[PDB]
Amino acid sequence: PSWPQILGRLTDNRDLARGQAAWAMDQIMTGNARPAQIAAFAVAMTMKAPTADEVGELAGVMLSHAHPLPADTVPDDAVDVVGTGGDGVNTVNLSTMAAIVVAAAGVPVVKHGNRAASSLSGGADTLEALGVRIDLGPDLVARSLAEVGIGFCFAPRFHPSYRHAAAVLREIGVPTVFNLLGPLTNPARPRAGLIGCAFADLAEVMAGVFAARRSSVLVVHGDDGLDELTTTTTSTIWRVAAGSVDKLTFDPAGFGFARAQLDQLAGGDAQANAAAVRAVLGGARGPVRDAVVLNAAGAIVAHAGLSSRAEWLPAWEEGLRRASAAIDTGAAEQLLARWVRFGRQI
Amino acid sequence: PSWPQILGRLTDNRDLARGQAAWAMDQIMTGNARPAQIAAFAVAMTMKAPTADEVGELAGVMLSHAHPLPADTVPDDAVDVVGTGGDGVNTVNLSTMAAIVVAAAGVPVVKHGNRAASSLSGGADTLEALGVRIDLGPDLVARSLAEVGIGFCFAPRFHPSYRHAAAVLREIGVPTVFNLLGPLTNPARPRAGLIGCAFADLAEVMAGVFAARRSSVLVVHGDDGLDELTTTTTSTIWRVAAGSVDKLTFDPAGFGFARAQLDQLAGGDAQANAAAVRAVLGGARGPVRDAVVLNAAGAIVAHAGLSSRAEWLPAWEEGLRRASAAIDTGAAEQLLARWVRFGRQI
Ligand SMILES: O=P(O)(O)OC[C@H]1O[C@H](OP(=O)(O)OP(=O)(O)O)[C@H](O)[C@@H]1O
Ligand SMILES: O=P(O)(O)OC[C@H]1O[C@H](OP(=O)(O)OP(=O)(O)O)[C@H](O)[C@@H]1O
Ligand SMILES: [Mg+2]
Ligand SMILES: [Mg+2]
């Protein structure tokens, strides 16, 4: 195959043949692709409308080039809590906060992330400011996970071959199909997760990729455009279980959640967002907390769905019970401190 | 305006705002665009179907950075004979053949061109293979048009700022909206022409750009896929006249043209394309001659179209009759030779 062959086809508004997206991404990962070819491919693939197979081959190749974690160090039931980003809105780090709470409820967590692309502080940014280390390689992410209950995979450190593509996509400035990869390329390959998507027309495609692996994942998009489960309004959820997707709308009001204004969830620089995490874990009641509990519940229901013998509602109310208890007992706050303390000790 | 604004809008399948296409082009020409941005723009402008205004803006910006010809050196009734190519044939043998016939019939021709991408011989290549100096500055092109009756503007010499876009578009290696520009960025700004386009949908767009200029133009797509008037079957013509456009069907059988086969008309190697020209200008009667004569008449008919008193069928017979004569008298063969001598006498 070739670039004009592949680019020609996409610009003809045609789905690619099996293996074509993989060859293209492999060319990219292996540094054999000129910056203009990367850009054309990325834009062309977005405007055509990508398929699950296509994006699955993109994520597949990427993973196959990624640093893996050591064998028998990632639990069978580990969850991820990560979004695509591209909110447009500049919220406090909801995914990061819920991750800590989830791990504090004793659900193993291997989080993928990096810095903000558009926002003032990313997950990795906010974690850095807290004094939790985001540099850790495969072996120490494995250690951290077993020793603290949570581990953090920093995307650049696990995905060096993405460097070629990453610079190019920054220059473009528009989001593309590539903005989907982060959540689909966690190097630990955890089989569950809560997965945020800022682009409502692409979210089904992510769900499609997760269903191919037979993951238990809720792909989420707030109807306010949030790549999290919102408290402002309702959220659309593509539930991924048993290798099939199904669409839902989710209403916090049915679990007694006060509706909220978007700007109550608004965020700032790293220090500020790190202050917000200390606040919430510390027990500050209000909008931000509600948001964190909600999403933390979400991930826990995805965990629960690893088992086929599971109903939606009883699992959500268990989830909300546990996220809330994880904060209120101080266990969440403990865990963060335990985790910082882990990093300062090789 | 902005790159992210313009690229995002395109990726939403939205037509641009008045001025944006121009701003994008203007950044490219000025050197203010990343190759990643050039690539995203060219791909997206294509997949979202481009409009006449958008392409006019791109053409206009390009023309406003170009070296013009000296004042009062291009006659008001000058014509261009040219195709988009990318027919995948090629047509270069036909366009340069008709161009010379036309000039030889006493219609000033100023052609715009480049060395080929897809085919072995292209407009400039074939010209260069016949001994013609294709790379002359504005003054010498005017002197050529004055003395020889034809001039060729070499797109690299006349559009220095376009260098960036060309390098980028070579790498993506597939047709984009930028492939319509050549015919619409003649530095000599000639107000008539026969304009071949391999893209049916884009032809109508090119036509509307020429309508905006009040040029008298026949945009032509061979219904056999050719970017010239074919003799293989019927053609589609977009008659541009009085700032308006009429889509037509054209059949050369109504002038006694035998149906040829597509593989008797196809351009080839530059050294081959050259010999074919000597062959046919020397008097080689056949299906190549036929189709040169046809396209040459189209060019002359287009020239006739500058007067609103011009009528269609008589214009075509005067056209056919004059092109035939230019060949048979040897005026055309003789014109090629004076054009070659001209270059050798500077
Ligand atoms: O910067 P953007 O492209 O707008 O993306 C929004 C943020 O989301 C990502 O983190 P992640 O989703 O892992 O965690 P978060 O939701 O807690 O930030 C990333 O780190 C960004 O800072
Ligand atoms: O890009 P390609 O597909 O190789 O096209 C071959 C040639 O056709 C065009 O020139 P010209 O208009 O002189 O020839 P045509 O009008 O017959 O296409 C184009 O500028 C090339 O020189
Ligand atoms: Mg998120
Ligand atoms: Mg977010």
Swiss-Prot record, chains A, B:
Q: Which InterPro entries match?
A: Anthranilate_Pribosyl_Tfrase, Glycosyl_Trfase_fam3, Glycosyl_Trfase_fam3_N_dom, Glycosyl_Trfase_fam3_N_dom_sf, Nuc_phospho_transferase
What's the cofactor? Mg(2+)
GO biological processes = L-tryptophan biosynthetic process
Q: What pathway annotation does it carry?
A: Amino-acid biosynthesis; L-tryptophan biosynthesis; L-tryptophan from chorismate: step 2/5
Q: Which UniProt keywords apply?
A: Amino-acid biosynthesis, Aromatic amino acid biosynthesis, Glycosyltransferase, Magnesium, Metal-binding, Transferase, Tryptophan biosynthesis
Q: Which residues bind anthranilate 1?
A: G83, N114
Catalysed reaction(s) here are:
N-(5-phospho-beta-D-ribosyl)anthranilate + diphosphate = 5-phospho-alpha-D-ribose 1-diphosphate + anthranilate
Function as written in the Swiss-Prot or TrEMBL entry: Catalyzes the transfer of the phosphoribosyl group of 5-phosphorylribose-1-pyrophosphate (PRPP) to anthranilate to yield N-(5'-phosphoribosyl)-anthranilate (PRA).
- The protein's assembly and partners: Homodimer.
Q: What is this protein called?
A: Anthranilate phosphoribosyltransferase
Where does this protein come from, organism-wise?
A: Mycobacterium tuberculosis (strain ATCC 25177 / H37Ra)
